[PDB]
Amino acid sequence: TIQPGTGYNNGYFYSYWNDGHGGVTYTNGPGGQFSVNWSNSGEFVGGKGWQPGTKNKVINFSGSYNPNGNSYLSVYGWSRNPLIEYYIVENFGTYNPSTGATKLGEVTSDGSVYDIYRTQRVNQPSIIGTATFYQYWSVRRNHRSSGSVNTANHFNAWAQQGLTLGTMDYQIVAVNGYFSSGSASITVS
């Protein structure tokens, strides 16, 4: 079990963040493996991957994802200049993160269609401090907890629709949570 923060474990970059509310335990395991157990958490996100990401990485993931409430399983990361928080959402709990959001396209990739959206966070935490910034989403229609993600298909589709990315910062397979409970065990490569 580890502190919120970033670093490397068994060859993989990890990032683990929470809002200080408690109720979340994040564990690094062998190789590309990590687990998350949470109960009446606040806001958090953690996982394993790369620092920096690339714009054509093929990300593989496998495991078990059992949210009880608001939670996502995604390819998650950031760009700088412009500052963008992005998600390729493979599964989720009680809330589709695109609810109420403007649909800006579709993309077929890795066995499913995905719907593309853009949202905005206002004076929220980020990799550069409190800021206002856009979020890009691909939301998979066919939910799963194992597979491969050809990231170039999403980044290219986003760019086509006017959702461009800057320089890549980190890029991980992550479990997100917002005031919820659950467990998950995921292996990345």
Ligand SMILES: O[C@@H]1[C@@H](O)[C@H](O[C@@H]2CO[C@@H](O[C@@H]3CO[C@@H](O)[C@H](O)[C@H]3O)[C@H](O)[C@H]2O)OC[C@H]1O
């Ligand atoms: O110390 C800083 C770290 O705390 C800082 O971490 C980033 C903080 O913002 C986090 O993003 C939130 C995760 O939840 C999403 O649901 C929200 O939309 C985000 O606002 C991000 O994951 C962390 O990496 O990085 C900067 C350090 O100096």
